[PDB]
Assembly symmetry: C3
Homo-oligomer: 201 residues x 3
């Protein structure tokens, strides 16, 4: 009701069957289908495919296929990135991942949400809001990060949580919905798992 890409940028409802958006996705799903079917030994092909797939990729990135996204060109990753099986990034808009981020299996990231009232989405209306994942963050298995969310630096996201609100840095958050359960302190510098202490050398 004004150019479509102009509304995406302002957070207004839109649809994406025009302005070359439908082809930007085809170019994208085409590079993804090549990465998902690539033989595990095709390490070079893979290492280079992920450079083409994402808009920005820092050095030392590794993504265990398969990966799924809408357009790959809206995803910006930092250094030493590591993602496990089935990462899904619905990136109809900006998705920014910081340095040293670790992603567990089956994680879903989405900047897109639809209007709750069935009347506002008769034609698949949608809204998009940037997701920002800070540095040295660890997202557990089966996590879901919602639109417009920001995970503060160094934080950890419990497996299975649905993140719907900004998450502050240096905390351990979890739950449905996701809540900060505690702050990461010095006790965590010694106790890495349950009752096991890192008898440092």
């Amino acid at each position: 009701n004004m150019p479509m890409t102009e509304r995406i940028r302002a957070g207004k409802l839109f649809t994406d069957m025009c302005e070359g958006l439908p082809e930007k996705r085809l170019r994208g799903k085409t590079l993804m289908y090549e990465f998902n079917h690539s033989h595990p030994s095709e390490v070079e092909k893979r290492e280079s495919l992920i450079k083409e797939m994402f808009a920005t990729v820092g050095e030392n990135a590794w993504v265990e296929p398969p990966v799924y996204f809408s357009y790959g060109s809206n995803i910006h990753i930092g250094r030493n990135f590591y993602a496990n099986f089935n990462l899904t990034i619905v990136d109809d808009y900006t998705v920014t991942i910081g340095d040293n981020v670790l992603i567990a299996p089956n994680v879903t990231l989405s900047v897109t949400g639809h209007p709750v009232h069935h009347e506002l989405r008769k034609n698949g209306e949608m809204y998009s809001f940037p997701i920002t994942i800070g540095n040295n963050v660890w997202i557990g298995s089966h996590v879901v990060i919602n639109p417009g969310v920001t995970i503060g630096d160094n934080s950890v996201i419990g497996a299975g949580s649905i993140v719907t609100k900004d998450i502050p840095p240096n905390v351990v958050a979890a739950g449905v919905p996701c809540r900060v359960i505690r702050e990461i302190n010095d006790r965590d510098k010694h106790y890495y798992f349950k009752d096991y202490k890192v008898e440092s050398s």
Copy 2:
């Protein structure tokens, strides 16, 4: 016990290694393997493949691969259906989806379940109860819909919820387990997301 398929229709426990069921499952996993490995540019092949896979398909359906099901023939879908990545439907029995239904990535629908008592499932005994999804329904990411569940028209299922009980129409529901959190009213006709209003034209 009486014809296995007869038992399926009655809601009795049963095993599916007979009466041609194992081959009906082969015919379907065959079509599904062709859909999931199809190249993104094979638009015509996909469109016609989804007409073959499911029992009934309304016009304007679109399923983003991959898709996973037991048999394809027990799934009935209405108009303008849209499913995102990895939709899984365990349809050992009828699964019915209405019109204008929207499915987020990684959703699981299952008519089938097993008896909790280990002595009752020694031989993979199971039960199947039809799932009915009303018109204009939006199911969020990572949701799981259990057997016999009925989602009412215009309702919205929040990401990550586990639906074990019917959801009335016109509501926003969520949680583990799912519960109605509020009714969708006219405020949702103006405010589509958080604090952003549809300054309607």
Copy 3:
């Protein structure tokens, strides 16, 4: 530090880019890639592939592709095993599954975890603790079993739960996080689902 494999067996922090671990993973993803890309009709190639993939496999095993794992060799499985779509086992160390175990679609098992304090994982430091799954257990859809977890015999794990603590045998557990909701008694020997009783013949 100490030989890396020696640390794994001890429950000490480690990394896995040495001692031939990277190649044990390649031999693994290769067999896996073959299994996930096989035609639903290549029943024999599949049957024989799972015997190659996993360390130990009992008779009458079935795994609906796709399956995902770190190394195949660390997973041991009993008799009559059944895993639906997208089972994921992050077995950087041992994973033992008993007899007659049934697994729903989209289940994630991980023996590995990372230190909570970002300073302890600069180089992808990780820890591994075996996961033991008792006999005649039934795991629901979208379940995540964390490191060092033991599921007791004859137990049931509701769909969508995040298991972080051992589960006693003969119970029905569920939730985020998981919790014993009740013990499985003789009532379950009669009522298999909600209000449907097995009118025993």
